[PDB]
Every structure is written in C-alpha cells, then in structure tokens.
Design a protein around this ligand. Structure first.
Ligand SMILES: NC(=O)c1ccc[n+]([C@@H]2O[C@H](COP(=O)([O-])OP(=O)(O)OC[C@H]3O[C@@H](n4cnc5c(N)ncnc54)[C@H](OP(=O)(O)O)[C@@H]3O)[C@@H](O)[C@H]2O)c1
Length: 347
C-alpha cells in the first residue's frame, strides 16, 4: 500500500489530462493528503495558467503549465502521460525507473509487433499492463505495477460488450462493432472538421473498413478470451455530443439468450463499474456521463440469428481518465473504486 504519492500530468492542457485532474481533485487520497498534485506539463501551452485551458478546474486555475521535460517531471512518484502517441517511449525512458508511469496513448497497448507497425508506422516499443481491470487476467497484472497502458475508448466499450459471450463460446468470432462517439474523443487540437459549426446537427462515420487503429486493439482483447480466429468489423461514428460512446456490437449466434445472459452475470456480477440493465431497459450514454460506469444490455435477434450487445460509457472516464485512475488505485494498493463514482451526471 502506497503511503504518499506526488503525481505529475504531462499533457495537462488536453482533454484526457483535464479529466485526470478532475478525478484526482475528487479522489479521497487528495482530500486526506496522501495524493499530491505536482507538475502540470504541456508543449506550446507552457507558461500559461491551467484556468486558460480548463476553466472547470478552478481549485487549480492558478497553476502555471510547465514544459514537458524530464527535469520538470522528476521527483514525482507517479506520472500520467496524456499526450499524442509516439512520445511516451522516449519520455518514459527519461524518468526514474521506479516511477509509476500511466500512459493514456497507444504506444504500450499492443502485443503484436507486425500489427503495431502496420497501423502505426513505427517500430513496436513493446507492451505494458493493459488498464482494463474487468478483462479476464487484467486485474492481477495491474496490482503493484509501475507501468500501465490505458485502453483506447472504443475498445473499452467493445470489449466489455463482447468478451463474456465470446469467452463462453456462445457467439461466432467474426464480430461487428458500430459505435457512436461524442467529439471530445478526437482531442483538443483544433481542426476544421471538429469545429462546432461542422459537428452540431451532423453525424458521420470515419476511418471505416478496418483503417481505424482501434480495430486491432478490439481484435487483441478478444483473441485473449478465445482460441478461434477473431475478425473485427469496426465503424466509428462521430455524433453531436461532447462525451459518450454507445457501442452496438453484433455477432452470429445460435445460443439461447438465457445462456448468453448467464455468461454476462458470471463475468460482471461482482464488478462495481459494470451495470447490467434490468429487463426491458437499454443503455444510454446520458446515464454514464461523468461516471466510471459501463451500462450493458444483451439480446438475441432470432430471425437474424444475431447476438446484440449494447454498451454505453463516458469516453473520457471509463474510456480514458477513469480507467487510468482505476488502474492507478490498483498499482498503489488503494481501494479500486476510490475517486470513481458509478453515478452519472444527467440530464
Ligand atoms: N480524449 C479521449 O477521449 C481519449 C481517449 C483515449 C485515449 N486518449 C489518448 O490521450 C492522449 C491525448 O489525447 P487528448 O484527447 O487528451 O488530446 P488533446 O486534448 O489534444 O491534448 C493533448 C495534450 O498533449 C500535449 N502535447 C502535444 N504534443 C506534445 C509534445 N510534443 N510534448 C508534450 N506535450 C504535448 C498538448 O499540449 P499543448 O496544449 O501545449 O499542445 C495537450 O496538453 C492521446 O494519445 C489519445 O490517444 C484520449
């Protein structure tokens, strides 16, 4: 059990960095003095105050953003990396080795070098314990870890929706995922196609037909629960919301619905963040915003011989920062649910 942890956040001015800070402010270790918020770093934002970026985080508004450098990041027991991929290997190498390093990007997520290279165009750096505690065998690798690779947002929703059925061998291993997402998932770098005037009142699929980099990440998590050949058709759709992922996940099945439901019960009955919808209810992203919860319902389309699983998460909490803090709690030997509410902020 960690006694006193001074935390830095690299990429503090971005959405993921902002959300880590929000959750750390609400964490009971912050309140009782055991967790201390240190250096807040970025690139070009350095020299500005945090309030200029995250006006919702008023207790920290006056903090001056510092450059993202080893000298600034030194002397922290834990360092969150909330930066675009391709910096954390370089950066992680510069930090004291015993630092708990929690990487929100993709660099340490994937376990196959040829898959990595294909989708990311660089040499594979390797892999770190995957920050999705609810996956079979995941929680054990996170306890006492000094290294965490936080999952992508879409794979979190897809894996939670699909792994129990596939693990029980109750569906075919060719899965289809169509997931809608709020725009905060795309980050805070200004581009035309993320402007409000463009996104408000409009929906669009993007990176379709296997080009999205989260495709192999879904396939990897699934391959860990079955011996069968997994395929993934993944289509992300940007919708006019700031937060939220609703993943619609399908696969061929000939199994009774009651057996599929039993597989979800077994997987999730004692998982505090997973909420199985009551009969006749279905998830909505509105219900999970600002919580670390995933709300899940499953069904069978008999005419179509198709299993349907719906999963809703907050992309910034269970999809990113909440996953990071949940995994942090595990790494430090603190109660896993600390700082992480299952109650949504709705309407
Ligand atoms: N947002 C999500 O829903 C989500 C979900 C899953 C994973 N992630 C991951 O989180 C990471 C950041 O995403 P985001 O959505 O939070 O992006 P973002 O909102 O654009 O913020 C990016 C942050 O990184 C900083 N940065 C950029 N280049 C840097 C550099 N060369 N050195 C140091 N800092 C640099 C920026 O600083 P400046 O302000 O100075 O530019 C900013 O603080 C990505 O790897 C992404 O894959 C995000």
């Amino acid at each position: 059990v960690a006694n006193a942890t001074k935390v830095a956040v690299a990429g503090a001015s971005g959405y993921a960095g902002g959300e880590i800070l929000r959750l750390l402010l609400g964490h009971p270790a912050y309140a009782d003095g055991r967790l201390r918020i240190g250096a807040l770093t970025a690139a070009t934002s350095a020299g500005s105050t945090l309030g200029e970026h995250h006006p919702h985080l008023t207790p920290l508004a006056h903090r001056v953003v510092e450059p993202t450098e080893a000298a600034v990041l030194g002397g922290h027991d834990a360092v969150f990396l909330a930066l675009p991929h391709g910096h954390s290997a370089v950066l992680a190498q510069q930090l004291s080795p015993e630092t708990l390093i929690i990487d929100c990007g993709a660099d340490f997520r994937l376990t196959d070098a040829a898959v990595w290279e294909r989708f990311y165009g660089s040499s594979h750096a390797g892999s770190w314990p995957y920050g999705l505690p609810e996956l079979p065998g995941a929680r054990d690798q996170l306890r006492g870890t000094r290294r965490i690779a936080v999952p992508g947002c879409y794979p979190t929703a897809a894996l939670l929706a699909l792994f129990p059925a596939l693990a029980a061998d109750l569906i075919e291993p060719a899965v289809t995922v169509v997931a809608v997402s709020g725009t905060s998932g795309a980050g805070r770098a200004a581009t035309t196609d993320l402007l409000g005037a463009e996104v408000i009142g409009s929906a669009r699929a993007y990176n379709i037909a296997g080009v999205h980099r989260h495709t192999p990440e879904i396939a990897q998590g699934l391959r860990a629960v079955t011996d069968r050949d997994v395929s993934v058709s993944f289509t992300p759709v940007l919708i006019p919301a700031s937060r939220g992922i609703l993943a619609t996940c399908t696969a061929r099945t000939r199994s009774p619905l009651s057996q599929l439901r039993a597989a979800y019960e077994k997987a999730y009955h004692a998982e505090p963040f997973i909420y199985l919808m009551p009969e006749g209810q279905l998830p909505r992203t509105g219900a999970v915003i600002g919580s670390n919860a995933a709300h899940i319902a499953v069904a069978v389309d008999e005419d179509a011989q198709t299993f349907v699983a719906i999963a809703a998460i907050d992309n910034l909490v269970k999809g990113t920062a909440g996953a990071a803090v949940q995994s942090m709690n595990l790494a430090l030997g603190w109660p896993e649910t600390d700082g992480l509410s299952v109650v949504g902020v709705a309407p």
